[PDB]
Design a protein around this ligand. Structure first.
Ligand code: PX4
Ligand code: PX4
Ligand code: PX4
Ligand code: PX4
Ligand code: PX4
Ligand code: PX4
Ligand code: PX4
Ligand code: PX4
Ligand code: PX4
Ligand code: PX4
Ligand code: 1N7
Ligand code: 1N7
Ligand code: 1N7
Ligand code: 1N7
Ligand code: NA
Ligand code: NA
Lengths: 221, 221, 221, 221
């Protein structure tokens, strides 16, 4: 029995059928935004969602059976179990059920290759991320103390300062929307932001080049 | 006769004459925006367009003759045939007739080299493009469900959500124009967009570095 | 006595205790933005700041003792001494005391590695920075003379021209916010800014690629 | 006499004295924006400008003497002669006299190295620039025909369309400022701009990577 059930679970066709269920359910989720289409086929849509979630849950049961230790030590099946379990509980969280469509990435081998390649790079940049978060923390405290009183919408609390600094980093309306109105009152805020812009852009560039060399040295040898 | 006609078609000078026709027709298309110049020489312009399209169509006939199987299996001549045929039909589509100027790229060898080099890179990034389209699909459904009611202009339907997410990806007015007005009502939309910005920017950077390594390894060996 | 005191200063645990003091003081600085929390525990916060600054100052004394010549010839301890001394003087400068949190970078070995790696790149780009500053100087003088009278907010003095040019370089509202309102009066300002944008973007790209090759050649050999 | 005059012109100190004149004249040009400083020392400033331009012109005469054929076949001295001659003619052109400060780049060896390195890259990208200019031409004609009537400020003539397309390429207010107001009337303009944005960004990325490989292969061998 274990032989038959594992030869079914690890068979190509079981994964293919759940892929087709994933694709049809993704189209289903894409169609429920329409008020008109919901009015047309609410009952059919809900029925389809019930049957596909039943098949996905029984699939998760079979998979957690065939590999019990491996299921909770494999991030892909961990993610599948988490998304299925989240989709299971009814009432808010309805929005996060759309993350089940990421299971299309779980099933497809090429998408899995891409995502593993993407994840393997973070170990090379955790350090720079930590430095950047500390630098953001420091300059956000400075911005809140300096401009929080006169411009509470942008720096009144620490969080809005973190937000404004992330925005200035992105270089989106940093001068016209933030710095120039600050200079309308605090005429020497550029001593804060021009060094901030220089520093944060410089660090982002260095992060990119470090990523380049780490992804290239695995090929140069 | 086949000898003479192919020695004329594949001759340097036939392609050169059609190049000069392409250049003169490009100037012609560049001049028809002027209301004043149209008033001045409408009849001369229309006459020139008729004669050049006749020469281009007879050229396409001769080329489709000398290489019949090759014509429909060669993307350059496929594009030339398509643009000439589109320009042929009269009445809207008048705007797309300007794409005939891309035939200057078809004729010139260096432009052909550049375009082939550009196309040869997409096989290395189709996977990342597919992942990005799926990710855009998922977060666009989420954005439509969350913000479609209170901000229908940006997320009322799925398409406007795809548009707003592409824009936020470009980092054009993502905070002042979208996120901050959302926080005016939904105070916790940054939990959606800050991860979205981080993720989408990160994926774009990885796409660029993968393109770099694929275009460099063809030289390192 | 010198043996014991240096075996204490260069011991792992003294640096670890000052790290924990750094972290607790960073949380403390992060909490003083709250008007509510200040009202709650002003006396406790001030007491903690006094005791931690006393420990940091005695630490700086011990370190400047164990290595006197090295202290003023080591940029890390130079920075630590500078930030501690700045934090020492009471009354403005209260904002700059937050830079003591950068001492977390001083203590942590990995952060030190990152920062040294970042600094080692500037010798490869001082030349390009000098050229860019000269180019900014020249075009800022030009912008002040041309547009300073009709648009004094952006080019009335040299400094506001430097600012506007840095902004245009960043590509933030360069056309809608600057160039188009200029063309509302000076219709041929794009002859100034389009070459400026082309040139400044081109130089920034070349700076990035030069940084790439300098950081890669240290690995290729 | 030729021996003495060339040993003076090509001597280190003649170039150093003209460098000091360049630096002092650059400060002079930097000070004339001030209405107050002009009121203070107009006569002194004009006198200094007269004497430095006399020394620069006699220097250009001596240099064009020592190397007559080389002077008009050397781009650096060509630029020096051009800027000095432009500065010579009085009356508009007063703004372009500031380009004499680029002669600081001419004199300094390191700046010359940087600029030659920058120029040596364009031969590798003239082709891509030509393709991009043709693509801009085509889509600008399309934009003028489509949106010139309803939005003449952005596409009424060909030039304003070239400008708007360059701006959209830069990704500055492309959606909120251009595309969305167009969709207020022409609801299907994104079929024009989303492909335009994709294409133009993609080509710019490929230009950058080609520059990288051309500047790296000169080192890999
Ligand atoms: C990943 C590649 C495929 C991506 C496809 C994206 C397609 C986007 C289409 C957007 C269409 C919007 C234009 C439109 O008018 O569509 C109408 C429907 C619903 O109309 P609606 O606005 O609800 O009408 C209400 C009228 N009222 C208030 C008076 C009662 O508007 C909608 O609700 C959207 C239509 C749903 C399309 C679903 C496409 C599923 C693709 C599956 C791919 C996997
Ligand atoms: C470890 C690997 C993955 C790392 C990816 C993430 C790295 C950054 C982690 C940041 C940790 C700190 C998060 C944080 O401080 O968030 C604070 C704000 C909260 O805003 P909040 O005050 O809640 O606004 C609501 C106002 N309310 C309550 C009255 C309604 O929320 C924000 O505004 C967040 C904005 C972005 C913060 C940027 C922090 C530094 C990012 C550096 C990343 C690398 C850049 C090259
Ligand atoms: C690829 C490199 C070459 C690129 C060249 C780009 C040249 C752009 C020129 C833009 C000039 C706009 C300034 C201007 O005032 O031009 C006037 C003409 C037409 O005037 P228009 O605005 O129609 O006058 C109407 C007056 N009204 C309403 C009272 C009856 O405005 C126009 O219609 C535009 C003039 C057409 C220039 C065509 C240049 C062809 C270059 C061919 C390269 C291949
Ligand atoms: C004006 C807007 C776009 C209008 C339609 C665009 C499509 C038509 C353009 C045709 C242009 C000519 C195509 C072409 O040159 O293809 C050659 C490339 C490069 O060759 P290469 O990789 O050197 O040769 C490999 C062949 N091998 C392995 C047997 C030695 O070999 C390949 O083609 C590799 C396959 C890549 C296919 C991906 C092409 C997708 C283009 C879609 C453009 C949509 C724009 C939004
Ligand atoms: C295969 C090789 C070449 C690949 C290049 C293209 C890759 C992306 C394909 C996207 C396929 C899905 C297209 C799509 O969903 O378009 C939906 C919207 C339509 O807006 P729509 O709802 O029609 O607005 C009109 C409103 N109405 C009807 C009432 C007047 O139209 C849009 O808003 C389109 C906006 C861009 C969509 C971005 C989708 C993901 C792009 C990821 C590309 C890589 C990024 C690094
Ligand atoms: C580096 C990773 C950790 C980053 C953590 C970032 C946390 C940001 C939290 C922002 C929270 C803002 C939302 C909020 O309502 O917070 C309330 C407090 C103070 O309230 P407040 O606005 O002063 O109330 C005044 C009311 N009034 C005028 C009527 C008297 O608002 C505040 O003052 C901010 C709360 C302080 C949080 C400190 C977190 C320390 C993390 C240490 C990490 C090292
Ligand atoms: C918070 C805002 C900034 C506050 C002030 C910033 C300045 C103080 C920061 C001190 C941090 C520690 C400095 C440091 O680690 O320098 C080490 C680097 C890298 O060493 P490395 O290149 O590995 O060693 C080469 C030595 N050799 C050839 C004999 C083997 O060796 C070098 O230093 C090479 C020389 C480069 C000097 C350029 C540094 C300019 C920094 C200016 C920052 C201004 C921000 C706007
Ligand atoms: C050496 C290694 C590290 C190098 C990093 C820094 C490199 C740039 C150094 C710039 C030196 C010149 C600084 C400068 O000219 O600042 C002038 C403006 C001052 O504005 P200001 O006139 O005080 O405005 C206040 C108005 N008021 C007095 C009536 C209230 O202040 C500003 O607006 C500054 C804006 C940025 C200036 C950009 C100058 C060229 C930067 C090129 C950097 C590389 C780019 C790829
Ligand atoms: C390359 C690195 C060095 C870069 C240095 C950049 C320095 C920028 C300084 C900007 C200062 C602006 C603040 C300020 O209030 O300055 C006053 C002067 C002129 O005042 P002004 O606005 O003419 O007063 C008119 C008053 N009114 C209408 C009632 C008669 O405002 C000015 O005209 C500007 C002052 C000229 C500074 C020249 C610095 C030369 C550096 C040479 C480097 C080579
Ligand atoms: C060869 C090596 C160096 C190459 C660098 C330059 C490459 C681009 C050359 C462009 C040649 C065509 C220039 C052109 O068409 O300019 C037309 C517009 C003129 O605006 P205009 O109609 O005069 O506006 C005034 C209105 N009026 C008369 C009534 C007052 O003037 C503009 O709007 C210019 C805006 C930029 C045009 C962008 C053309 C394609 C650039 C592609 C560069 C590479 C991008 C990756
Ligand atoms: C990459 C390791 C793998 C790798 O690719 N190395 C090759 C060089 C890159 C680097 C980059 C970020 C580094 C961590 C951070 O600093 C924080 C932390 C500092 C403490 O001291 C304890 C160690 C920690 C966990 C570090 C471990 C390790 O050092 C990491 C993961
Ligand atoms: C490049 C191949 C050529 C190349 O340069 N390879 C070297 C590595 C890059 C990669 C990148 C994108 C890949 C496709 C996508 O995943 C979708 C799809 C998944 C299914 O399973 C069926 C295969 C498909 C068509 C894939 C084939 C192939 O795998 C592609 C073209
Ligand atoms: C890097 C040197 C180390 C290095 O990595 N070299 C390898 C090539 C890069 C380059 C880049 C910037 C260069 C300086 C500037 O031009 C200004 C100045 C010009 C004068 O003449 C006097 C010398 C100065 C100080 C230059 C020295 C040296 O030339 C520097 C530091
Ligand atoms: C670089 C040459 C030097 C180099 O680095 N080559 C190595 C490969 C890059 C390339 C890039 C741009 C190329 C020109 C353009 O296409 C326009 C033109 C096409 C006509 O047919 C006549 C030749 C022209 C002048 C081309 C010559 C040459 O082909 C150029 C300069
Ligand atoms: Na912007
Ligand atoms: Na931008």
């Amino acid at each position: 029995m274990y032989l038959r059930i594992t030869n079914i679970v690890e068979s190509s066709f079981f994964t293919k059928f759940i892929i087709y269920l994933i694709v049809l359910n993704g189209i289903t989720m894409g169609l429920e935004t329409s008020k008109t289409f919901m009015q047309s086929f609410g009952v059919y849509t809900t029925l389809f969602k019930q049957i596909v979630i039943t098949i996905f849950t029984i699939e998760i049961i079979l998979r957690i059976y065939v590999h019990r230790i491996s299921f909770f030590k494999d991030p892909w099946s961990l993610f599948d179990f988490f998304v299925v379990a989240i989709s299971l509980v009814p009432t808010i969280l309805r929005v996060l059920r759309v993350l089940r469509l990421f299971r299309l990435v779980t099933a497809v081998p090429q998408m899995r290759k891409i995502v593993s390649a993407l994840i393997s790079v973070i170990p090379g940049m955790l350090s720079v991320i930590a430095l950047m978060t500390l630098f953001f923390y420091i300059f956000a405290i400075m911005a809140t103390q300096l401009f929080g009183e006169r411009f509470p919408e942008w720096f009144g609390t620490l969080g809005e300062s973190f937000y404004t600094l992330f925005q200035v980093m992105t270089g989106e309306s940093w001068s016209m929307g933030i710095v120039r109105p600050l200079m309308e009152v605090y005429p020497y805020a550029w001593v804060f932001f021009i060094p901030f812009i220089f520093v944060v852009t410089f660090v982002m560039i260095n992060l990119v080049v470090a990523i380049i060399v780490d992804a290239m040295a695995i090929l140069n040898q």
